[PDB]
C-alpha cells in the first residue's frame, strides 16, 4: 500500500510484501540471535504488542542492500530516533532466525554475511513506536529491505542501547540522537554515555540539543576529559552526538 511516514524513497524499489495488523506481538532482538538446543536465544530483546505495519522492498539490480540500509539508517537517525541496536553480517547472528522467527518472512533469508539489522525507538510524540529495518542480499543476487513500525499498545520501558552499539553507530553514521534521555543528566543514560566514552577513550564528540551544556558537564564530572567534547547548536529536545574525526 503505502510507505512508513519516516523512511526514505529507495529509487525504483518495489513493495513485494505489505502487512498490517492492529495488535501483533513483536520480539525484536537487542543482540545476536541464535538457537541453543533448538530453543530461540537473543542477547537481549524488546517485546511489544501493538499496531504493526511491515513493508518488504525488492531493490532494483543497480543498488545494493547495504546502500539502501545505510540510507534507511541515516534517515531514521536524522529523524532523531534513539538507536537501540545495530549490527551487520554475522554480528546479527542467524539470518534464518531474523527472517523467520522475528519478521516471519522467509523471503528475507539469505547468507548471514550479507545481512544488516537496525532497531530504533521514535522520538516523542511517537515515543512508544519502534521501527525495525533488516536488509539482505540473496544468492539469487536480488536485494531486499524490510521496514516495520510497531506502535506499542502500552508505554515502552526505558530502552537503552549498549555502549558498543553507540560507538559503532557513531562511526558508521557519523552522528545520532538520544531522544529519550532525562532533561537533568543522571541515571541509566548518563551511565551509558560514561561507559561508552571509557570504552574508546580517543573518540571525540560534539554535543548539541536543548540541554547539551548540562550533559557535557555531567560527563566531565564523571571523568570524561573536557577536550573530548565540543558544543554545537541545536534546539532538538534530545542529546545529539556528532563524531569529531
Describe this structure in words.
This protein has 245 residues and is α+β, with helices and mostly antiparallel strands. Strand 2 (33-36) and strand 3 form a beta hairpin. It contains 5 helices and 12 strands. The strands form 3 sheets. It has a 6-stranded antiparallel beta sheet. It has 2 domains: 14-152, no CATH class; 163-244, OmpA-like domain (60s Ribosomal Protein L30, Chain: A, 2-Layer Sandwich), CATH 3.30.1330. The relative contact order is 0.15. The chain is globular. It has helices spanning 65-78, 95-102, 163-173, 187-199, 212-221, and strands at 14-29, 33-36, 39-42, 45-58, 82-88, 116-121, 129-137, 143-152, 175-178, 204-208, 229-231, 239-244. The PDB classes it as unknown function. Keywords: periplasmic protein, unique fold, unknown function.
Quickly list its features:
245 residues; 5 helices; 23% helix; DUF4892; disulfide bond; six-stranded antiparallel beta sheet; signal; alpha+beta; periplasm
Could you write a compact summary of the structure shown?
It is classed as unknown function. The protein is an alpha+beta fold.
- H/E series: EEEEHEHEEEHEHEHEE
By DSSP (H or I, 4+ residues per run), the number of helices equals 5
Task: Report how far apart the termini are.
Answer: 41 Å
Any idea what the shape is?
globular
Largest sheet, in brief, is: 6 strands, antiparallel
Task: Provide the gyration radius in Å.
Answer: 18 Å
Beta percentage is 35-45%
Question: What's the arrangement of strands in the largest beta sheet?
Answer: 1-4-8-7-6-5
Q: Into which percent range does the helicity of residues fall?
A: 10-25%
Number of domains: 2
- Overall structural class, as computed from helix and strand content, comes to alpha+beta
How many strands? 12
